[PDB]
């Protein structure tokens, strides 16, 4: 209702727009699939080995390793999407190239897991663009090293999902994440911090208007960044372990570039 906020709202609408355009599977779609809505169709459920083998009919000499390779390839694609989304954050392409690379390097994983929560409930996670649903227990039942990779994400998702954020909230939130001045090796932090200040102002107003009855959701939302960091650290530690165990296992280069010095 005033010039300043009017501009923030425009920023919010801009980001939501690019968000829809960049990410095929939104939380709205995911939620309609997971809760039995007639706007979307129900997923084939993978809860053990037979259903796994059956799912390939409906949707590396070891299922645990090919499930892992599946997630890594889906991550590579995710990076591509986030990158596409980042270019649309006003000011981002105008930054030093080196810093754009740096912002993406430390930003993608925190964003992947933020958005992964949209495809999860306490029982499992959507796969193959919402055509599949792989249960938590089946993932946990995977052999030593791989049985542990998905659990920390489920823990995060259940608490994050309690915030009850929709896509328009998330659009701004993942932009705040990308534009973090504290990232290691940033040449010029000042222009980055000015953009973030703007996003944070937009997120704050968005949360007020969207969740008026929700006290300190802004503060609560920002505190989730601690859990995100911890997820990423554990993940790369787990990967360090995999590389010694499976020397025949290959990590995508784009992913390996992102992992080193993390
Ligand atoms: C949710 C899951 C299992 C998934 C989702 C869709 Br959709 C699929 O099509 C498939 Br196959 C698998 C997944 C797991 C991880 Br671990 C991951 O990134 S990672 O954590 O950086 O490796 C990402 Br991205 C996605």
UniProtKB/Swiss-Prot annotation:
GO terms for cellular component: chromatin; cytosol; intracellular membrane-bounded organelle; nucleoplasm; nucleus; receptor complex; RNA polymerase II transcription regulator complex. Highest expression in adipose tissue. Lower in skeletal muscle, spleen, heart and liver. Also detectable in placenta, lung and ovary. It is found in: Nucleus; Cytoplasm. Rosiglitazone binds at residues 72-75, 109, 235, 259. Residues 1-49 are annotated as: Interaction with FAM120B. There is a cross-link at residue 21 (Glycyl lysine isopeptide (Lys-Gly) (interchain with G-Cter in ubiquitin)). Nuclear receptor that binds peroxisome proliferators such as hypolipidemic drugs and fatty acids. Once activated by a ligand, the nuclear receptor binds to DNA specific PPAR response elements (PPRE) and modulates the transcription of its target genes, such as acyl-CoA oxidase. It therefore controls the peroxisomal beta-oxidation pathway of fatty acids. Key regulator of adipocyte differentiation and glucose homeostasis. ARF6 acts as a key regulator of the tissue-specific adipocyte P2 (aP2) enhancer. This is Peroxisome proliferator-activated receptor gamma. It comes from Homo sapiens (Human). The lineage of its organism: Eukaryota, Metazoa, Chordata, Craniata, Vertebrata. The chain holds residues 232 to 504 of 505 of the full protein.
């Amino acid at each position: 209702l005033n010039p300043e906020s009017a501009d923030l709202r425009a920023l919010a609408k801009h980001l939501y727009d690019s968000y829809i355009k960049s990410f095929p599977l939104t939380k709205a779609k995911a939620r309609a699939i997971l809760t039995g809505k007639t706007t979307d169709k129900s997923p084939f459920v993978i809860y053990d080995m037979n259903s796994l083998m059956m799912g390939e009919d409906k949707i590396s000499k070891e299922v645990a390793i090919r499930i892992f390779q599946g997630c890594q390839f889906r991550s590579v694609e995710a990076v591509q999407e986030i990158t596409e989304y980042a270019k649309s954050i006003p000011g981002f392409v105008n930054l030093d190239l080196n810093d754009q690379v740096t912002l993406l390097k430390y930003g993608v994983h925190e964003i992947i897991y933020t958005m992964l929560a949209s495809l999860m409930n306490k029982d499992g996670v959507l796969i193959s663009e919402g055509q599949g649903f792989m249960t938590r227990e089946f993932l946990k039942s995977l052999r030593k090293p791989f049985g542990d990779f998905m659990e920390p994400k489920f823990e995060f998702a259940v608490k994050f999902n309690a915030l009850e954020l929709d896509d328009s909230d998330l659009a701004i939130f993942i932009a705040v994440i990308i534009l973090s001045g504290d990232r290691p090796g940033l040449l010029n932090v000042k222009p980055i911090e000015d953009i973030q200040d703007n996003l944070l102002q937009a997120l704050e107003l968005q949360l007020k208007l969207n969740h008026p009855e929700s006290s300190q959701l802004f503060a609560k939302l920002l505190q989730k960044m601690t859990d995100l960091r911890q997820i990423v650290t554990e993940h790369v530690q787990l990967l360090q372990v995999i590389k010694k165990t499976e020397t025949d296992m290959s990590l995508h280069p784009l992913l390996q570039e992102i992992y080193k010095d993390l």
